[PDB]
Amino acid sequence: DPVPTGGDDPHKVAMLGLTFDDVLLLPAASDVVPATADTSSQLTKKIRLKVPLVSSAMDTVTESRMAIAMARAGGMGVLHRNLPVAEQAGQVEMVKRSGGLLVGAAVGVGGDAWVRAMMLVDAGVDVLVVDTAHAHNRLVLDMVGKLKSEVGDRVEVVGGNVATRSAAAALVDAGADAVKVGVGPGSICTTRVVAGVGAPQITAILEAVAACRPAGVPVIADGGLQYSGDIAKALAAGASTAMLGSLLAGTAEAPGELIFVNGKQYKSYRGMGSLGAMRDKLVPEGIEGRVPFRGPLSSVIHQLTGGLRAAMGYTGSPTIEVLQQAQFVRITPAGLKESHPHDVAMTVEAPNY
Amino acid sequence: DPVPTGGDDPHKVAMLGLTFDDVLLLPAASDVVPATADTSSQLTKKIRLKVPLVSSAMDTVTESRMAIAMARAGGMGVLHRNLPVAEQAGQVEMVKRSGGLLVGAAVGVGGDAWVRAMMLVDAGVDVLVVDTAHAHNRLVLDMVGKLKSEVGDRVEVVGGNVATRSAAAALVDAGADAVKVGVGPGSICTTRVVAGVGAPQITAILEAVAACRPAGVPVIADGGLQYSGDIAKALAAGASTAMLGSLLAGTAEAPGELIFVNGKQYKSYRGMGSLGAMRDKLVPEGIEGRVPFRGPLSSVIHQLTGGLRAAMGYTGSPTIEVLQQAQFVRITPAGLKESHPHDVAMTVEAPNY
Amino acid sequence: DPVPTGGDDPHKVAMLGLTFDDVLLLPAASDVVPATADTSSQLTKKIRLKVPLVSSAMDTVTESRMAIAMARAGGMGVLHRNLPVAEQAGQVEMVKRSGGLLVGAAVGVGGDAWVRAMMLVDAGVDVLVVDTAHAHNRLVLDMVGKLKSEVGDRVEVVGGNVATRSAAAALVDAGADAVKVGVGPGSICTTRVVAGVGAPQITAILEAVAACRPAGVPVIADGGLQYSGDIAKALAAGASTAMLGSLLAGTAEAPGELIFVNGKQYKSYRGMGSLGAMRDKLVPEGIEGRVPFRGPLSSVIHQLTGGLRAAMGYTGSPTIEVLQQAQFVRITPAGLKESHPHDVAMTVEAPNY
Amino acid sequence: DPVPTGGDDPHKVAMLGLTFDDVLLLPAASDVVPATADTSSQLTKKIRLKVPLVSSAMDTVTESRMAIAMARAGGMGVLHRNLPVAEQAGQVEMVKRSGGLLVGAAVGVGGDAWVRAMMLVDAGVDVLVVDTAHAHNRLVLDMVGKLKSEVGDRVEVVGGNVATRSAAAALVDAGADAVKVGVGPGSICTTRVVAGVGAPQITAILEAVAACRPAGVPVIADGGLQYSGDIAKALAAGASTAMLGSLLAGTAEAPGELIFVNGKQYKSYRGMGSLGAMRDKLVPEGIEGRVPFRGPLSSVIHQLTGGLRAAMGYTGSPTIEVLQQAQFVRITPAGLKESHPHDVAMTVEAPNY
Numbered sequence A, B, C, D: 001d002p003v004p005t006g007g008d009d010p011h012k013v014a015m016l017g018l019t020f021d022d023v024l025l026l027p028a029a030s031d032v033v034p035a036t037a038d039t040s041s042q043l044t045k046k047i048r049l050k051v052p053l054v055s056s057a058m059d060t061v062t063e064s065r066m067a068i069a070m071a072r073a074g075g076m077g078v079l080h081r082n083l084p085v086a087e088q089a090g091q092v093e094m095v096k097r098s099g100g101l102l103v104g105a106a107v108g109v110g111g112d113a114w115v116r117a118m119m120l121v122d123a124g125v126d127v128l129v130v131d132t133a134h135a136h137n138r139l140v141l142d143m144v145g146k147l148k149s150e151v152g153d154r155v156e157v158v159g160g161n162v163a164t165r166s167a168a169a170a171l172v173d174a175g176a177d178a179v180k181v182g183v184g185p186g187s188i189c190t191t192r193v194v195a196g197v198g199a200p201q202i203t204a205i206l207e208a209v210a211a212c213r214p215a216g217v218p219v220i221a222d223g224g225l226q227y228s229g230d231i232a233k234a235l236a237a238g239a240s241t242a243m244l245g246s247l248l249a250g251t252a253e254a255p256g257e258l259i260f261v262n263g264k265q266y267k268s269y270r271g272m273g274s275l276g277a278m279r280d281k282l283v284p285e286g287i288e289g290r291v292p293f294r295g296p297l298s299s300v301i302h303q304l305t306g307g308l309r310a311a312m313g314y315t316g317s318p319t320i321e322v323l324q325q326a327q328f329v330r331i332t333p334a335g336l337k338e339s340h341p342h343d344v345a346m347t348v349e350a351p352n353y
């Protein structure tokens, strides 16, 4: 007799995938108030951040100005690779010359990516991010492994992106110092629609963590974060840091000029797999768009950490490590409606909503 | 082999959370007609109300005028604490001097909250509501316990808010005379989005009740009530009273002036954790907004009790205590669409819809 | 350890409720083409209709003109009771004098309802419909029983409305000749919102049928039917006839004048529990609104039967009795989107969509 | 004790139906990059295509121009039958005279359909598509069988449409060379609403394949495909080719003139069961509408194959046959929201979104 959803193979539909909106954190016994929570966390095996946030390696998000401001806010930036090797390495130099700030840089896969990585390491980069659509591909695992054996002593090597336990386990055996999770949840991403491929971000973190935690390897949750609450959910699912693109793209520090359409303020934000970024045989997996202007980075980060601090008070988590042990309740479409404010016209501006 | 939603921990996603919209009451055998239902119910262990409704302790909802009108309608009001101690206590005096009416007042936690509580008790308040975001926090449980031991004989002490069985059990062992349930369902609340924390209100009541009912402690369902039907659902899930903010904020008795935008009538309604209420390092967990003007309180309460009376006739519940034994059917997104009127342009105004 | 949705009572949430939109009929082996399907079916134990459709007893739907046209189309009408007893009985006379046409009439419960029923029976009505919000109430069951014992020989007695197996079983033991199912699915109904009470219509039919079919008592599915496809679903769930309000209210034969707002054509349609119908202590359980004008009844019925005929060809059902043995597939929100036409601007008018 | 959704029959609701939007492909270990994927696949038992795509047999989609362009792009077209037999056969001749291109043609059931098929076979058609609403009907199975025995040696015979395992098994025993799947998922289809009949397309493919694969008979997934990602999902569910209507209707090669409403470009697209196509006793099962103009076919096909190539790289599938072994993760409504780009205003045009 058949599997309820079709066919005679119970593993054809392997699992049920949950995203951030499908779940809430459960309040627990607490001796923690928001002010006394400690928000520090491992970016990689060797690098601990004061604030568990990293800015995305995208040409509309992180250049030296964002990397500097992020590091000073206690987080880190990853410099995008959509520029010539000399300029990317130069921006690494601009950051390290602003007071020994932490900084990462993305590279792709191949000989040119190899030359890029070597120039970044010479410029003093702290973290190399091997930055690909599908980390489970053999080329990526080999590139991670070779950087690891070659520099490794010198620098941390992160690999992404993955959406499964087996892929995270493969990066760990390749020697990854951290594993970055997220195939298709990005706000500007179209992978799930163009290729039909991906995994909902909460389930993707839970699965990657089932592989990375036993190996002592930290998980970076990347993409799909829209609110401070999602950061707490990603960390409680077992991630150690979160990487943000659209939440940080509207900020003053993000590269790009202010757009003034309708006497309203916007900034361009685009996928690195979008047509405008890659530059007609290209098949793009991202879109180009715009986000509201959100003002200074510092005040965006204060709001995000403040929301995370509230979640730690609610779950009784004095540190990120205890937050990673929190429980979820799953919700329905109706519970999401309730979870957001409802049945009121919002008349005054809110900083975190 | 994994848990279907991710990882190897079957308790990581502890349960499935239902809100008011996810469920309907099942009709049952009835010898009860709406007119003959008895709507009385316990607010606390010592205090029984004629109508099982309480107005929220919010600066846009309950001041002496609302408390007076609520008590005369057979319910009760809880005076908000966003004012100086002398004025809050003075408003308690204004209410008690209108004919021995019942009244509650909110307090926070701490020495100033202690002084506030002592002035309220001296003014003759009947119920102290310890009014916090997270009742499971140690400070709140201690504050409940100390008020209980100190005044206790004199006054009833309610604690909130909670969303779990263990938190309700902790308030009961601290000596709470009632437990108030609701983390994040409020119409103006942003906790679930800012902190990612909460529990859907039907499941939250069912769980709190599993702890409070064996201890003979009544549950106040607080927040997320939009229609008279939700009140019946909350009571049938085991709550003894319901607390309303937005349903009562549009009324004449609510503090605040009438707003006339578009030749339409509104009243301001805002979270107590909203930016405008608390008064840039604040991290708000509510929004400021507006609700339609709904006219006299008395006629709003008549509609709410009338809807509750209909539910009692449908479920065969002569009293609230029997209603608390009713059954639910769970519905899908499509069943909600059907449950509301559909496929018609509503052309004339309805008092309860 | 708890029930997943809350508490320690596995029966508190008794079941999962499906509505028409949650399910599709499964195609089966067929030697039936739409043209050769036989659409006849039992209205009651004694009365078989050529077309398994009845018009609702509502003041915006069925008066003598609709009853006449319905009967001539092979269905039946139920004359509403929102008029004086002499006029209702007179309309029964107008119908019987148009060629021995079938006709029903609604009555409520009580002595006045008793006098009304006796005048209707004298006028020659074929079916008395005891027409109430909650058939499981003791007054309704007694009224059904007394009419049954008193007239019974003379006339058929239908009872409604019910949403459960136990309520349908109670009407059967009271002597009902048919059981009408539907609490809250009506397009103009607000019971599920005002009282929070009801059951999704597919599950409600399946349950009523589990009680009525073993007793040889036909089930009338009443309310929530928006498309011809829903009629086939209701019959396949085990109903023998369907009762329609909004699908027939836009027709020329429906009482009421044509409304011409925006150079568009509408007809008033309102719940019998709406404020305008019942005529400020009333608590209404319906709304007043308007529906598009749909032209002649005859061509609406042709479309509805044609859709039902297609379903019979698809399921291989030569008769309604075989259709009642068909199977459903349950769908998700995404399957409903797919089921309706999608991703196209509809530019030309369709008669059945 | 009852079945949770109603009644005492566990098979009344036979299964849970998934559509394309309910699922994503899971990334897997890969030694495949998009460029090196091989997209060839069986259309029928005897015919392998370079690109696993077929254009729909609809009067707004496939006439000789589309059939020619499709075949040159490595796919195939099926010429619609809403024209006189001499013109349809003539269009077959126009295609075969453009360099030995592959071509199919639709026929219905009956003697006229028989004469049509014989003229098509004489014109040199490669595939006859027996093109009906319900393939499980006895007339269709006999028509498939008779064509098979009569021509069979000469030509391939495909049968559709089906939505169940038993129906696909019946076509296989009738001698079908391929089975076409899809009852009601079409963008312009109204079967699920008019008749209430159908099955969600992912489950329908899984079930048909459970019957066709053991018999070595290829499955054509037909209808409901809106994005390149859906094609990959349909193939991974076990289909061998996909048939497209609306994705190809906006193209220059599609029959019909360009529409210029609002200084925007559209093309007419309509169901073959729509009122305008069939030409008031007709009961239509489709609508007439319009789709955006999408430019040259060639560049639409490049985008579709490019998306499919990405999915093959992500799942580690060097060929379509390995893709058919990929796994799904099921998603919720919230996961779909995430899967599409979200929380950004799309400002620049995307070729595949």
Ligand SMILES: C=C(C)c1cccc(C(C)(C)NC(=O)Nc2ccc(Cl)c(C(=O)N(C)C)c2)c1
Binding pocket: A109, A132, A133, A134, A135, A137, A139, A140, A191, A272, A273, A274, A283, A284, A285, A286, D030, D032, D033, D034, D310, D313, D314
């Ligand atoms: C973050 C994403 C999705 C992104 C970013 C930049 C550029 C791209 C473009 C559009 C070039 N798309 C791909 O790169 N897609 C891809 C897919 C599968 C595979 Cl297997 C491969 C591949 O060749 N790998 C070695 C991973 C590439 C995607």
Ligand SMILES: C=C(C)c1cccc(C(C)(C)NC(=O)Nc2ccc(Cl)c(C(=O)N(C)C)c2)c1
Binding pocket: A030, A032, A033, A034, A310, A313, A314, B109, B132, B133, B134, B135, B137, B139, B140, B191, B272, B273, B274, B283, B284, B285, B286
């Ligand atoms: C009803 C709500 C959500 C509300 C009402 C007024 C003010 C607030 C503000 C914005 C100050 N937010 C918090 O108070 N959040 C909070 C969270 C966790 C905790 Cl643990 C604590 C805490 O310190 N406690 C002792 C409960 C406080 C919230």
Ligand SMILES: C=C(C)c1cccc(C(C)(C)NC(=O)Nc2ccc(Cl)c(C(=O)N(C)C)c2)c1
Binding pocket: B030, B032, B033, B034, B310, B313, B314, C109, C132, C133, C134, C135, C137, C139, C140, C191, C272, C273, C274, C283, C284, C285, C286
């Ligand atoms: C179809 C509906 C829902 C309808 C139609 C006309 C009028 C009404 C009004 C508004 C008067 N509402 C009720 O009648 N509600 C009701 C509820 C429970 C009960 Cl128990 C009773 C009752 O007294 N019964 C004897 C059934 C009545 C409802």
Ligand SMILES: C=C(C)c1cccc(C(C)(C)NC(=O)Nc2ccc(Cl)c(C(=O)N(C)C)c2)c1
Binding pocket: C030, C032, C033, C034, C310, C313, C314, D109, D132, D133, D134, D135, D137, D139, D140, D191, D272, D273, D274, D283, D284, D285, D286
């Ligand atoms: C693709 C669809 C749904 C389509 C295409 C063209 C025309 C039609 C019209 C409107 C004529 N509708 C039907 O043909 N419906 C139908 C249903 C069941 C059946 Cl059993 C039969 C039937 O007689 N068969 C022999 C299959 C026909 C449908």
Ligand SMILES: O=c1[nH]cnc2c1ncn2[C@@H]1O[C@H](COP(=O)(O)O)[C@@H](O)[C@H]1O
Binding pocket: A056, A057, A058, A161, A182, A184, A185, A186, A187, A188, A189, A190, A191, A222, A223, A224, A225, A243, A244, A245, A246, A247, A270, A271, A272, A273, A274, A285, A286, A287
């Ligand atoms: O165009 C692309 N396609 C798919 N994912 C992308 C693309 N560009 C950036 N990303 C991912 O999306 C993340 C940002 O997602 P967001 O914060 O939800 O906007 C980045 O950190 C990358 O992991």
Ligand SMILES: O=c1[nH]cnc2c1ncn2[C@@H]1O[C@H](COP(=O)(O)O)[C@@H](O)[C@H]1O
Binding pocket: B056, B057, B058, B161, B182, B184, B185, B186, B187, B188, B189, B190, B191, B222, B223, B224, B225, B243, B244, B245, B246, B247, B270, B271, B272, B273, B274, B285, B286, B287
């Ligand atoms: O700003 C806040 N954040 C979260 N909850 C709040 C806030 N202010 C009031 N509440 C809660 O929300 C309830 C009112 O919810 P409502 O009736 O659904 O509008 C109150 O009774 C409080 O329990």
Ligand SMILES: O=c1[nH]cnc2c1ncn2[C@@H]1O[C@H](COP(=O)(O)O)[C@@H](O)[C@H]1O
Binding pocket: C056, C057, C058, C161, C182, C184, C185, C186, C187, C188, C189, C190, C191, C222, C223, C224, C225, C243, C244, C245, C246, C247, C270, C271, C272, C273, C274, C285, C286, C287
């Ligand atoms: O006002 C009312 N409240 C609830 N149900 C009603 C009311 N008036 C009519 N009904 C029911 O709704 C049905 C019509 O539903 P519709 O065809 O979905 O519009 C009627 O046949 C009655 O069973």
Ligand SMILES: O=c1[nH]cnc2c1ncn2[C@@H]1O[C@H](COP(=O)(O)O)[C@@H](O)[C@H]1O
Binding pocket: D056, D057, D058, D161, D182, D184, D185, D186, D187, D188, D189, D190, D191, D222, D223, D224, D225, D243, D244, D245, D246, D247, D270, D271, D272, D273, D274, D285, D286, D287
């Ligand atoms: O009018 C009709 N009713 C139902 N299905 C249709 C009708 N006309 C075409 N189809 C189907 O719909 C498919 C196209 O669906 P689409 O690509 O999703 O627009 C065709 O290949 C046929 O299988």
